[PDB]
Symmetry: D2
């Protein structure tokens, strides 16, 4: 797949009494990595929001293989496992500061009008985004491995 790599430094505030990063904070890290993937493809989510279209998460999955600690510097690998004009599924891997796989997960996102909350086809409102995502989907299907920067 076409993937991005995002570096995140764990915060003390993100710890819990167990002494590890609280499991509920991982969605925030996925969101930082997903917005970094979007940036690196050449797009701005902040831009899309400026146009009255929002992109909610419809499904979150996190699988915690190893705990993460403060003050680890981690890397998040992000890619789009499935793209269609109605929904996208992002997948993630988090590597700990020793380079080991600590976490896997996924998020499904759709796009909806902000007034209505009604879903929308991305090719009708953002054909530039659609073209890029469709291109990437075809590269992923062919087995291309590339880091976008």
């Amino acid at each position: 797949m076409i993937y991005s790599i995002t570096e995140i430094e764990a915060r003390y505030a993100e710890t819990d009494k167990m002494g590890v990063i609280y499991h509920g904070n991982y969605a925030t890290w996925f969101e930082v990595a997903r917005l970094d993937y979007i940036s690196k493809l050449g797009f701005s989510y902040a831009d899309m929001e400026k146009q009255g279209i929002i992109s909610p998460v419809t499904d979150l999955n996190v699988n915690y293989k190893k705990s993460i600690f403060y003050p680890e510097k981690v890397k998040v690998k992000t890619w789009v496992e499935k793209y269609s004009r109605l929904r996208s599924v992002y997948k993630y891997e988090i590597f700990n500061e020793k380079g080991e796989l600590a976490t896997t997960g996924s998020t499904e996102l759709i796009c909806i009008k902000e007034d209505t909350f009604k879903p929308i086809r991305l090719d009708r409102y953002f054909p530039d985004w659609h073209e890029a995502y469709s291109k990437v989907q075809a590269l992923n299907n062919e087995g291309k491995i590339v880091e976008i920067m």
Copy 2:
């Protein structure tokens, strides 16, 4: 003073690695208590937002006398130390599950227009809120001590 009392149950998620409630979370508890005070005076902040006026915090102060632990049930005492048509200063005391004073603090709030962020006089926009806050201020100045409910 005229005061409210708000019960809050500490969450596991609100802990940090030290094994106490993280200091940054206290603003959230002051907000819960302040919105409870407003509700018990007979108003709804959500109502105010529906009219296009929002009320940002301009100053936060927290003095931590004792740590608080999961799963303590605490009580927050809230009052308006100072009311004017341009700002309000709320004060707080947090009592831990043994009834000891754990925390004091304060928040200053103003009211601004949502679209421009420009400050407003409460009396011009919400005369009924103004009348209530004014009436409380005068009871406070007389040294009246009562729990609102």
Copy 3:
């Protein structure tokens, strides 16, 4: 199934700039619900931690059917879908103030030693929790439907 209902009132701090409850905050609400389930069944997670045992989440799933717009009072339905002495899977449903199904999800939990993070068996460290979970599991397999709550010995 044997289930609990927990009421949660959304907080302003839990909103994002869409005016909805931020999707990352739902894990906290599942925690509140799950700890309420355990209490209603007769047990205290803080008492487990006093013995030097912690119970972390090892898998999280949340499926968002409807946005939750603040303000809102919600009800969280919790039950144990699968119990074994090494891991439990809790499932959840969140209803909004109108009674509509807003969210579903699940959490897998293990128990470990606080010091080494080594996994332990619930029956060896907490035989009373094991007996209760094992009884629930059998009732759930028989299709019993019961709301547990304080003050009623409903099992």
Copy 4:
């Protein structure tokens, strides 16, 4: 004074319903910036915790001069306004992407034993930290203006 500059990029998760950074999240930004100051001075707070000493906040002030609308890259300026072997007071300034002063604030910290939460004197446990903070206090009193950073022995 002797100060650090920490860059923070705001997260969508940090926003509330007004579309601004929620006022309760600023403490976490002061934490990031304080830990950056500590690291740039040559120390690791993780290492302090390995030795069984923790350093909690005992007083928090935040004065919000301008809202911080998401997205934003901000710069946090941190310094130690007062050091003694029993407590430290850090001060902060946050500048927005336009260079404007958005926020000021302070945090008072002590050091305590992790097991008993009893307070300690920094000089009895960490003579290196005490010597560095005492030097910096002297330089701050004389009016020196220096940005500390990695790779430059600015003191």
